Design a protein around this ligand. Structure first.
Ligand SMILES: OC[C@H]1O[C@H](O[C@H]2[C@H](O)[C@@H](O)[C@H](OCCCCCCC3CCCCC3)O[C@@H]2CO)[C@H](O)[C@@H](O)[C@@H]1O
Ligand SMILES: OC[C@H]1O[C@H](O[C@H]2[C@H](O)[C@@H](O)[C@H](OCCCCCCC3CCCCC3)O[C@@H]2CO)[C@H](O)[C@@H](O)[C@@H]1O
Length: 265
């Protein structure tokens, strides 16, 4: 494979779309690869990691409990609710909601949680509290995936999202137990985690959250490294490409292949 930057460029050529990418050391925050790092991309379901960071901050402060059971109604549900649609009668705990949002991309679970943090505006305020002055959430599921060309709503930048993930996972803004919980939810992703493992060489750690939207939007926020260690944050977003889902997946994986082959930088 090409060097990572050259593979990223080839992916833009091939997709006709914009790619944004950061590769960052998790422990130190060193930026390794950066491409369109300050450009905006729709977050799509990748926002759900930040969402559950805000939930966990409430838990640490004594303002929420992961045990707390939320009852909700069928008329509340939005498109794609594989877990939450099963619990109309008995409800779900806040922690179960975060697990369904992160590990199954359950959209209604995400909206229920978003309401507990004060909606898109409240999650944006949480981002500002942790020093992310760029990432913004404006809408709920599923409109936040619309990815209109040139629309700043519901966007992050690769640099912002990488720095924010690192803050949530490592900076002691969250309690030790809450940092461990957020990481385990990403480890447990069922949407893409098993598929990624099936194509990773032996020894490579993965934890992730993926997203998809209109006009080719696609993204992943992940932890990756050899020796079974979460060594680096890797954030990749794609936008404004007409390519098939399969080809967008393949191009993201090809960037991953370049990272794996040129890991020592
Ligand atoms: O197995 C050996 C091959 O390994 C790589 O090939 C990669 C390729 O670079 C990538 O483009 C493709 O993607 C196939 C699709 C994989 C889907 C999983 C990726 C993720 C990304 C975000 C969420 C969806 C799933 O995989 C092949 C391996 O099979 C090297 O590029 C190639 O030189 C080598 O010969
Ligand atoms: O020399 C390095 C390795 O090169 C190949 O591995 C291939 C592998 O066979 C293929 O399936 C993968 O596709 C890439 C799959 C990427 C999945 C991670 C993607 C995510 C993770 C983080 C966020 C962004 C994308 O590429 C690697 C590197 O060529 C050999 O198969 C393997 O024996 C060898 O150890």
């Amino acid at each position: 494979s090409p060097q990572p930057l050259e593979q990223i460029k080839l992916s833009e050529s091939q997709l006709s779309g914009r790619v944004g990418m950061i590769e960052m050391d998790l422990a130190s925050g060193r930026t390794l690869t950066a491409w369109r790092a300050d450009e905006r991309f729709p977050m799509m379901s990748t926002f759900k990691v930040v969402l559950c960071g805000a939930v966990l901050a409430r838990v640490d402060a004594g303002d929420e409990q992961l045990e707390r059971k939320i009852h909700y109604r069928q008329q509340d549900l939005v498109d794609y609710s594989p877990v939450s649609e099963k619990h109309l009668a008995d409800g779900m705990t806040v922690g179960e909601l975060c697990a369904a949002a992160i590990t199954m991309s359950d959209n209604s679970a995400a909206n229920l949680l978003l309401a507990t943090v004060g909606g898109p505006a409240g999650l944006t305020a949480f981002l500002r509290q942790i020093g992310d002055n760029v990432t913004r959430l404006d809408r709920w599921e599923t409109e936040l995936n619309e990815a209109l060309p040139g629309d700043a709503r519901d966007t992050t930048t690769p640099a912002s999202m990488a720095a924010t993930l690192r803050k949530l996972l490592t900076s002691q803004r969250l309690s030790a137990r809450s940092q461990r919980q957020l990481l385990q939810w990403m480890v447990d992703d069922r949407v893409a985690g098993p598929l990624i493992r099936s194509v990773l060489p032996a020894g490579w750690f993965i934890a992730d959250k993926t997203g998809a939207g209109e006009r080719g939007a696609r993204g992943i926020v992940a932890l990756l490294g050899p020796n079974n260690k979460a060594e680096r944050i890797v954030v990749i977003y794609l936008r404004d490409t007409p390519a098939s889902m399969a080809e967008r997946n393949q191009q993201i994986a090809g960037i991953g292949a370049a990272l794996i082959e040129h890991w020592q930088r």
